[PDB]
Amino acid sequence: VRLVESGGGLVQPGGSLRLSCAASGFTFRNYDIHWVRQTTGKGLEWVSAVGTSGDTYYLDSVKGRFTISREDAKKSVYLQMNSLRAGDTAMYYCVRGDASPDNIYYYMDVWGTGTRVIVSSTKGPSVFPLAPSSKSTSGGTAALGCLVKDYFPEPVTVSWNSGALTSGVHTFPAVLQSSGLYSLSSVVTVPSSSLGTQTYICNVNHKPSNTKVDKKV
Amino acid sequence: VADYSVLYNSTFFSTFKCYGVSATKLNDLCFSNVYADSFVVKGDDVRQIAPGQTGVIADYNYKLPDDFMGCVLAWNTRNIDATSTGNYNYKYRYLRHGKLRPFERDISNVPFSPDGKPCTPPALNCYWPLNDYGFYTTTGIGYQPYRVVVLSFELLNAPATVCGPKLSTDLIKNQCVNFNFNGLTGTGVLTPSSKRFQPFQQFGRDVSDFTDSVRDPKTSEILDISPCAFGGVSVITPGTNASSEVAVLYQDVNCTDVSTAIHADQLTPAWRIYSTGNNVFQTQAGCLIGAEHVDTS
Amino acid sequence: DIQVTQSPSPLSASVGDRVTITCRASQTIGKYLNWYHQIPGKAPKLLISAASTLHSGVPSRFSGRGSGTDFTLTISSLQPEDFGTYYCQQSYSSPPWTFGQGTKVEIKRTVAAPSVFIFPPSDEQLKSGTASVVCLLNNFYPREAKVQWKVDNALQSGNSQESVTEQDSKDSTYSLSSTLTLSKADYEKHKVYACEVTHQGLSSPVTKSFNR
Numbered sequence: 001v002r003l004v005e006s007g008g009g010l011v012q013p014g015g016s017l018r019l020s021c022a023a024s025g026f027t028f029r030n031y032d033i034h035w036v037r038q039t040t041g042k043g044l045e046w047v048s049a050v051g052t053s054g055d056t057y058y059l060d061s062v063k064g065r066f067t068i069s070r071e072d073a074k075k076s077v078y079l080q081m082n083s084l085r086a087g088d089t090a091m092y093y094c095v096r097g098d099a100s101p102d103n104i105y106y107y108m109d110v111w112g113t114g115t116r117v118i119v120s121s122t123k124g125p126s127v128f129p130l131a132p133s134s135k136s137t138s139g140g141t142a143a144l145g146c147l148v149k150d151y152f153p154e155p156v157t158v159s160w161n162s163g164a165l166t167s168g169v170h171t172f173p174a175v176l177q178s179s180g181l182y183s184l185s186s187v188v189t190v191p192s193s194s195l196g197t198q199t200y201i202c203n204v205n206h207k208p209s210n211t212k213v214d215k216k217v
Numbered sequence: 218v219a220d221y222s223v224l225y226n227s228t229f230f231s232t233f234k235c236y237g238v239s240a241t242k243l244n245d246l247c248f249s250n251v252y253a254d255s256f257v258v259k260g261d262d263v264r265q266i267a268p269g270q271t272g273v274i275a276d277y278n279y280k281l282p283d284d285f286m287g288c289v290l291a292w293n294t295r296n297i298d299a300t301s302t303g304n305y306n307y308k309y310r311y312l313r314h315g316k317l318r319p320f321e322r323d324i325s326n327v328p329f330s331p332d333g334k335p336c337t338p339p340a341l342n343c344y345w346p347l348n349d350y351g352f353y354t355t356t357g358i359g360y361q362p363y364r365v366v367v368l369s370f371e372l373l374n375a376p377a378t379v380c381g382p383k384l385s386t387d388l389i390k391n392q393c394v395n396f397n398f399n400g401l402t403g404t405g406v407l408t409p410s411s412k413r414f415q416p417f418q419q420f421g422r423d424v425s426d427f428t429d430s431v432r433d434p435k436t437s438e439i440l441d442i443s444p445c446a447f448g449g450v451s452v453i454t455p456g457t458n459a460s461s462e463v464a465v466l467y468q469d470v471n472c473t474d475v476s477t478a479i480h481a482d483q484l485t486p487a488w489r490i491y492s493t494g495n496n497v498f499q500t501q502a503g504c505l506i507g508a509e510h511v512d513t514s
Numbered sequence: 515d516i517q518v519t520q521s522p523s524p525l526s527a528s529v530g531d532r533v534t535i536t537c538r539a540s541q542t543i544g545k546y547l548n549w550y551h552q553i554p555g556k557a558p559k560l561l562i563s564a565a566s567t568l569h570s571g572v573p574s575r576f577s578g579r580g581s582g583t584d585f586t587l588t589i590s591s592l593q594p595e596d597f598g599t600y601y602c603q604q605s606y607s608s609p610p611w612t613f614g615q616g617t618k619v620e621i622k623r624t625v626a627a628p629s630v631f632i633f634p635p636s637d638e639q640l641k642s643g644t645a646s647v648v649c650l651l652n653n654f655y656p657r658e659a660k661v662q663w664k665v666d667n668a669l670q671s672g673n674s675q676e677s678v679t680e681q682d683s684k685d686s687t688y689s690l691s692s693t694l695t696l697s698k699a700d701y702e703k704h705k706v707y708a709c710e711v712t713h714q715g716l717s718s719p720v721t722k723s724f725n726r
Binding site: 034036043044045046047057060093100104105106107108109111112113114128129130131132136141142143145147149168170171172173174175177183184185187 | 545546548550557558559560564567569571603605608609610611612613629631633634635636637638639646648650652675676677678679682684685689691693695724
């Protein structure tokens with residue numbers, strides 16, 4: 001029993017965009033199908049679900065807007081998003097609830113993968129080069145700078161020469177600003193000898209406009 | 218036999234709330250006893266119909282135990298229970314000694330005072346403890362007549378009086394499958410014919426005292442099971458010292474269902490290293506799988 | 515509806531085997547209360563049933579109890595692969611299907627001194643009209659220290675954004691990056707930019723500043 005998601009979200013608030021939820025070899029004719037909204041640090045409120053009969057429930061807030069449709073033979077469940085707002089951008093899941101004797105509770109054990117409907121419009125990342133290496137603190141420890149801004153999606157990664165030493169460093173998750181963009185601040189630990197040695201090339205890539213760019217900071 | 222067909226369809230109810238039983242899985246449970254409670258509320262006042270929620274419409278007019286274990290519904294009737302010249306037809310109690318008991322009804326009409334006070338209409342402050350609603354046409358959303366139907370589901374120590382509906386299967390015809398037409402079990406091929414049954418006749422047997430046909434209990438009254446393919450399979454061997462190839466000799470078959478069973482792995486004597494190249498069908502055929510029907514003599 | 519609350523602060527993990535994960539609600543429920551578990555990074559999953567219908571997939575060490583109105587999650591010796599946020603859902607009201615808030619179980623570690631570093635904005639950034647002051651805070655276990663921004667002996671708040679990373683599996687420390695977004699005119703008007711760091715493991719608040 002496993003479900004795989006598909007599709008996503010790219011249209012602006014005020015359009016139509018449907019989703020899909022597949023199934024597996026399990027007998028999908030008597031169970032139910034739910035939807036989960038994960039806004040990464042908010043509430044997960046959803047009750048809209050359809051069953052074998054003509055049961056068509058909806059949420060109290062979003063009522064009469066989103067329609068539900070399931071197909072037993074096709075093993076696919078669709079969810080069209082009509083009149084999309086700006087506060088519904090989150091991750092959508094698909095689970096299955098069931099009760100042991102007849103009605104004890106809903107299992108919701110088997111989850112899916114997750115789908116986001118990021119509305120609005122993507123942006124092309126920009127990298128600020130020429131980070132201060134040694135202007136006020138030469139000895140001790142320091143770090144470089146590869147801050148990136150002006151990008152709606154963040155399917156990126158910051159590699160440091162594909163691995164050269166054994167220090168240990170990771171990136172920072174971006175946060176949504178007030179304007180509607182994200183910002184990342186990548187740092188790296190310096191070894192015992194960094195002045196006059198191998199530099200570090202931030203391998204920023206995966207641009208929505210398909211334009212690679214690399215520069216030493 | 219609670220079908221629960223008018224509850225899922227016609228999605229026009231305002232609040233479809235289920236407390237104990239699941240809102241979806243209802244066509245399988247066998248409730249002990251069900252009850253209906255109908256009343257009309259005024260707009261947004263439908264907020265105390267849940268176990269634990271108290272207020273003025275929860276202890277003076279209709280109470281609710283801590284474990285209700287049932288569903289409730291509510292549908293708007295603004296275009297029915299509202300006029301443009303006065304709809305003073307519904308009242309509610311809001312003054313009573315203490316609180317009501319679970320599943321209690323009181324139709325009393327008398328001024329109340331917890332100090333005696335027979336309360337002749339003017340005494341010092343006596344008045345009728347029954348206020349009328351404000352049902353009108355040009356009002357807001359929170360001032361509309363809402364008819365709340367309370368379904369009291371119970372699972373007490375009693376036989377299964379009320380249960381869910383019994384969904385019948387599809388009609389798989391022209392295939393040897395198992396059939397259960399309300400007790401009539403077995404296995405056969407559902408094929409129609411040109412017989413004429415009587416309206417009172419439910420099922421029909423053959424001359425050999427075997428069930429021949431029966432009307433579908435569901436709908437579309439037609440004929441029923443025909444016997445499947447069977448017989449004695451024989452092996453044709455031209456001699457071990459001569460060759461090592463054989464041919465099946467299925468005694469009495471149509472040489473069409475056996476091929477489908479072999480291609481779908483449905484026959485019981487299914488050999489692992491057996492195949493099919495050609496099928497011949499004559500009177501007492503014995504389909505020669507592996508032989509050619511030459512027109513010589 | 516059924517207002518269900520959880521623990522206000524996430525409880526860490528240690529060599530012990532006792533947690534304080536609760537799923538108290540407003541009304542009373544006999545057994546209409548389940549328990550879930552969401553590992554940060556992947557999808558959630560069912561962890562504990564209604565205390566009497568434990569299914570497969572979850573080891574028998576994860577137990578569950580509850581009666582009346584106070585529900586507790588009795589868990590056995592914790593495992594490093596069984597950490598994350600544990601949620602719970604009530605089963606006494608179908609329309610308001612809501613999940614829990616979140617009870618993260620991170621691993622106890624020695625309080626580490628945050629690496630206080632500040633980086634001035636690049637010269638090419640000022641050509642676009644923006645200026646971002648980045649203050650780096652790495653190598654610290656307690657995820658409770660907040661960054662204080664002071665510009666020209668004046669407290670600044672509301673224009674700073676912080677980013678907290680997950681707990682690493684190598685040193686069991688956290689990393690925080692606070693970026694102060696300011697305009698070009700406001701950046702050229704001021705000269706002093708200090709990043710005040712108040713941490714539990716530090717005897718004195720370490721403040722780093724630079725001159726423009």
